Amino acid sequence: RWIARTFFDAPEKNYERTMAILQIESEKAELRLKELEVRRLMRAKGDGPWFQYPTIDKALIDHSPKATPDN
């Protein structure tokens, strides 16, 4: 009883530590599976903001009436 009192840790503390670690890593696993599914559908469709390889930018494009009428 004395060794259990002065040197050890309570079973309630162990049990709530188990429930805490299972909750945390359950969040980890579900976020990771959602991450890989989001990544694969975002590559397959391209709607998301990630896999946007840099296209032509039109800020340098300035229209003006030229010398040739049919441009």
Binding site: I24, E27, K28, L31, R32, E35, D47, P49, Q52
Partner: protein
């Protein structure tokens, strides 16, 4: 009559009035297909660190 047009009076970009109105879409073209939904808003902190293998937080 007909005084000679001086230099540089065959220049000087000029207003002029017409009968028919100005057109829309002089390039016969469709609309822009699909705008990008922009991801906006202040960020929450990172959910459980890297979410790599280990070294959480």
């Amino acid at each position: 009559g007909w005084v000679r047009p001086d230099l540089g009076e065959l220049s000087k970009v000029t207003k002029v009035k017409t009968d028919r109105p100005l057109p829309e879409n002089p390039y016969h073209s469709r609309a822009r297909p699909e705008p990008n939904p922009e991801v906006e808003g202040d960020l929450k902190p990172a959910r459980h660190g890297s979410r790599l293998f280990f070294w959480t937080m």
